[PDB]
Amino acid sequence: LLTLDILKHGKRFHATVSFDTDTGLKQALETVNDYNPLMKDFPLNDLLSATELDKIRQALVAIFTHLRKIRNTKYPIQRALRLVEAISRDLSSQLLKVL
Amino acid sequence: DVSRFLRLYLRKEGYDFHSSSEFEIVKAIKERACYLSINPQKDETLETEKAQYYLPDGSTIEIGPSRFRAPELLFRPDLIGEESEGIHEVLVFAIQKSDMDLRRTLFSNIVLSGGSTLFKGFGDRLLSEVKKLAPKDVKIRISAPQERLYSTWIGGSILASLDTFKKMWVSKKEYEEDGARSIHRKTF
Amino acid sequence: RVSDEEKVRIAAKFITHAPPGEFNEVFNDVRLLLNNDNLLREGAAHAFAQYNMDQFTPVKIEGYEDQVLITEHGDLGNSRFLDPRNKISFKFDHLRKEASDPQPEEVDGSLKSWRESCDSALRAYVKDHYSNGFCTVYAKNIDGQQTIIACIESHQFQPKNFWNGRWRSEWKFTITPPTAQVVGVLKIQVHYYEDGNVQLVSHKDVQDSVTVSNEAQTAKEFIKIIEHAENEYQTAISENYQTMSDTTFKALRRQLPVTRTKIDWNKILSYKIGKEMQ
Amino acid sequence: SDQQLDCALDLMRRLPPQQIEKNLSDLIDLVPSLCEDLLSSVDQPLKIARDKVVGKDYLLCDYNRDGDSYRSPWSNKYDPPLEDGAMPSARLRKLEVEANNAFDQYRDLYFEGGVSSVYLWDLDHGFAGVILIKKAGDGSKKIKGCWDSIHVVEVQEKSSGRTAHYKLTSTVMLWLQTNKSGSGTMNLGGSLTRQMEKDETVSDCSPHIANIGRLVEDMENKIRSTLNEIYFGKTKDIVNGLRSVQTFADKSKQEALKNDLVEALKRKQ
């Protein structure tokens, strides 16, 4: 901020305004904050140590009900579809060792 | 060119200055010993006080009539022998070759810039000339800021210091892509 | 749902604004629309009477080949306008556009001398400046005042060329003998619709006076005031059309901007012109 | 009742362009079952709305008529308060706000005032918009004019490569009056409509909106021009052809020599 004050006090507005506008940190942080509660406390561990299919039943329903908060956070289409296939990837891995 | 014509008049006075590094002395004389007569002819029909001038060498030059007729060239390029126009005619033609709905606004806002607008009695003579060419009872207004030498530079400092200048320039990449046509395209 | 009595005001509104030479078409588009010929029969019949009494309708007189005009200032009820020329009464079907009963009108005698006098002078005037003009002069002792209501009408109904136009002109030659304040109106309605639609509607409230000196003198002098105002008015109208690209339209929309150049859309969209800076 | 509709459109065609709104309401009051069948091809003036949150103006037509509300492009809100309207694409919302900006510049350059609006909507391989411009005459001045413009534009963008197919349909509903002493009162109605389509190449320097701007500019120049000369000169010709200023029998002399030269020109054939 002291360097920014140097450039502001020296009437050079370029680097000062670009320090917040040219840097995409502001929009990156706001999208991060939009996805911030969605990424904290994710029940993937419910899927990790689940060897019994009943644990997997309740686990699958639990993870998707926690994922239900993407209605308010603008989730993308293709991102959600690759997400679903990733969920099925770990489902398949768990079932492979289960068999 | 006013300095060049002044050099010719100095030769006609008797004082010769023809060296390339002496033409600069002629410029110095133009910058500190010339003025603009209000009446262009009434003052020519009189003998002035003929003030002196000290050269860098230490000599002395009495100028005489070669000090007001020298910047007279700007208002009459007949002295240099040319069919061009004076400054006043450049203003009046620039205003009259525009939309008739803006003439009064343009006559109420004239800005001078450039170092040649620093002669004594320049603005006053310009007002007289424009009044002779503008239509009757139209407020003529000539401004003359104190930074006529620095007008274009200060304007550049204001223009380039804006955030829109990023979109107003021509990038190097763009110049390498299109070429000079990109400059003529985005010339404004 | 709309009642039936309002349809009379509707049809009256559509007939009283019908352009000249296009009355029949308004009638077809109102006959095939209002669906009740009885409602528009009475209401539109009164509207027809208005539309044909006000616009100086050209009515043909089969007996003397004159083609007189029906002016509002002369009637005896059942389309019984009193033809001043030839002193004949007549009935007239506003729709058929054919007169009826050329009974020799036993006029009471109001200003018949002035009628044919100023009529004659106006016949000369019409034959001078009007191509397809028609004159008609109503002589009447209106409310204890002798007056001449000279009327002028010219029109061109060319539907193949998609245009019309009806120069209408009235001149109340108020025969107030010491000061004939000849105040009348010259209303004009011109329609043109080739690949578009354009309507010219104008009128000049002419006001002039002269003492009724004599009859022939004020007849041709009435023509003097008429030729003055009409040449003046037509010429002035033409020059209003002349000074319209730069004044009237510039009040609405300029031809070119004040910078006298086109729009560099690339410039405006690419960056802000400096409008943020003042 | 289809012939009834044809005669109704012809009645509006011949209707006086001074009371378009009132008489259109009257014609709808005849057969109200044919009401919103006529409000698609009967040209009438515009309606000025008022964006409360922004402090601007925005015109009203069917394209902004979302449900029964109007999408204020200065705020992208609906008035009446319908929170269920058809919002445009966010992409098109940005394209629309810059469209409104560019046409405010356009309007200010030619009209020197007035109200404007540019709405937008989709297409499978492109998009389409409308451009409303309403310039009323200078209320202080005596010239009571009312310029009205509607520009239906449909951008039929091609596959790729950024070349498009810009279809445009315009309409100008003029209005004029002068209370000049030489003319008394000279009312002057009028209306036009044209179509034009060009395939200007799209680029980073030539976006779609710029192509549309050039088309709207050229179109209005042609309409204003075309009007002024063709139609208004035609009306001047009609008034001059009705009554002539020169006395007859003088015109017989000039037309006499005119027919003499007619014989002279068609004499040396």
Curated annotation (Swiss-Prot), chain A:
Domain of life according to the entry: Eukaryota
UniProt-reported outcome of changing residue 9 to R: In CMT2O and SMALED1
Compartments (UniProt record): Cytoplasm, Cytoskeleton
UniProt family annotation: Belongs to the dynein heavy chain family.
Disease / disorder: Charcot-Marie-Tooth disease, axonal, type 2O: An axonal form of Charcot-Marie-Tooth disease, a disorder of the peripheral nervous system, characterized by progressive weakness and atrophy, initially of the peroneal muscles and later of the distal muscles of the arms. Charcot-Marie-Tooth disease is classified in two main groups on the basis of electrophysiologic properties and histopathology: primary peripheral demyelinating neuropathies (designated CMT1 when they are dominantly inherited) and primary peripheral axonal neuropathies (CMT2).
Quaternary structure annotation from Swiss-Prot or TrEMBL: Homodimer. The cytoplasmic dynein 1 complex consists of two catalytic heavy chains (HCs) and a number of non-catalytic subunits presented by intermediate chains (ICs), light intermediate chains (LICs) and light chains (LCs); the composition seems to vary in respect to the IC, LIC and LC composition. The heavy chain homodimer serves as a scaffold for the probable homodimeric assembly of the respective non-catalytic subunits. The ICs and LICs bind directly to the HC dimer and dynein LCs assemble on the IC dimer. Interacts with DYNC1LI1; DYNC1LI1 and DYNC1LI2 bind mutually exclusive to DYNC1H1.
Species whose genome carries this gene: Homo sapiens
From Swiss-Prot, chain B:
Protein origin, superkingdom: Eukaryota
Coiled-coil intervals, chain numbering: none
Subcellular location: Cytoplasm, Cytoskeleton; Cytoplasm, Cytoskeleton, Microtubule organizing center, Centrosome; Cytoplasm, Cell cortex
Function: Part of the ACTR1A/ACTB filament around which the dynactin complex is built. The dynactin multiprotein complex activates the molecular motor dynein for ultra-processive transport along microtubules.
Subunit structure: Part of the ACTR1A/ACTB filament around which the dynactin complex is built. The filament contains 8 copies of ACTR1A and 1 ACTB. Interacts with dynein and adapters such as BICD2. Interacts with BCCIP (isoform 2/alpha).
Family membership: Belongs to the actin family. ARP1 subfamily.
Protein name: Alpha-centractin
Organism, scientific name: Sus scrofa (Pig)
Positions spanned in the full protein: 189 to 308 of 349
UniProtKB/Swiss-Prot annotation, chain C:
Molecular function in Gene Ontology: actin filament binding
Chief localisation class: cytoplasm
Keyword annotations from UniProtKB, A to Z: Acetylation, Actin capping, Actin-binding, Cytoplasm, Cytoskeleton, Phosphoprotein
InterPro entries membership: CapZ_alpha, CapZ_alpha/beta, CapZ_alpha/beta_2, CapZ_alpha_1, F-actin_cap_asu_CS
UniProt subcellular location: Cytoplasm, Cytoskeleton
Entry GO terms, CC: cortical cytoskeleton; F-actin capping protein complex
Gene Ontology biological-process entries: actin cytoskeleton organization; barbed-end actin filament capping
Pfam families linked: F-actin_cap_A
Modified residues (N6-acetyllysine): 13, 91
Residues modified to Phosphoserine: 3
Subunit relationships: Component of the F-actin capping complex, composed of a heterodimer of an alpha and a beta subunit. Subunit of dynactin, a multiprotein complex part of a tripartite complex with dynein and a adapter, such as BICDL1, BICD2 or HOOK3. The dynactin complex is built around ACTR1A/ACTB filament and consists of an actin-related filament composed of a shoulder domain, a pointed end and a barbed end. Its length is defined by its flexible shoulder domain. The soulder is composed of 2 DCTN1 subunits, 4 DCTN2 and 2 DCTN3.
Similarity remark: Belongs to the F-actin-capping protein alpha subunit family.
Stated name of the protein: F-actin-capping protein subunit alpha-1
Gene giving rise to this polypeptide: CAPZA1
UniProtKB/Swiss-Prot annotation, chain D:
UniProt KW keywords: Acetylation, Actin capping, Actin-binding, Cytoplasm, Cytoskeleton, Phosphoprotein
Compartments reported by the entry: Cytoplasm, Cytoskeleton; Cytoplasm, Myofibril, Sarcomere
Database matches in PROSITE patterns: F_ACTIN_CAPPING_BETA (PS00231)
Subunit structure: Component of the F-actin capping complex, composed of a heterodimer of an alpha and a beta subunit. Subunit of dynactin, a multiprotein complex part of a tripartite complex with dynein and a adapter, such as BICDL1, BICD2 or HOOK3. The dynactin complex is built around ACTR1A/ACTB filament and consists of an actin-related filament composed of a shoulder domain, a pointed end and a barbed end. Its length is defined by its flexible shoulder domain. The soulder is composed of 2 DCTN1 subunits, 4 DCTN2 and 2 DCTN3.
Modification type N6-acetyllysine: residues: 234
GO molecular function: actin binding
PANTHER family: F-ACTIN-CAPPING PROTEIN SUBUNIT BETA
Pfam families the record matches: F_actin_cap_B
Cellular component aspect of the GO annotation: F-actin capping protein complex; sarcomere; WASH complex
Protein name according to UniProt: F-actin-capping protein subunit beta
GO terms under biological process: actin cytoskeleton organization; barbed-end actin filament capping; cytoskeleton organization; regulation of cell morphogenesis
Keyword Acetylation in record: yes
Gene that produces this protein: CAPZB
Organism: Sus scrofa (Pig)
Family: Belongs to the F-actin-capping protein beta subunit family.
Lineage, top ranks: Eukaryota, Metazoa, Chordata, Craniata, Vertebrata
